[PDB]
């Protein structure tokens, strides 16, 4: 992450 923010 910053991605997906359940990473």
Known sequence: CPXQ???
Do not use: A, E
């Open 5 to 7: 923010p359940w990473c």
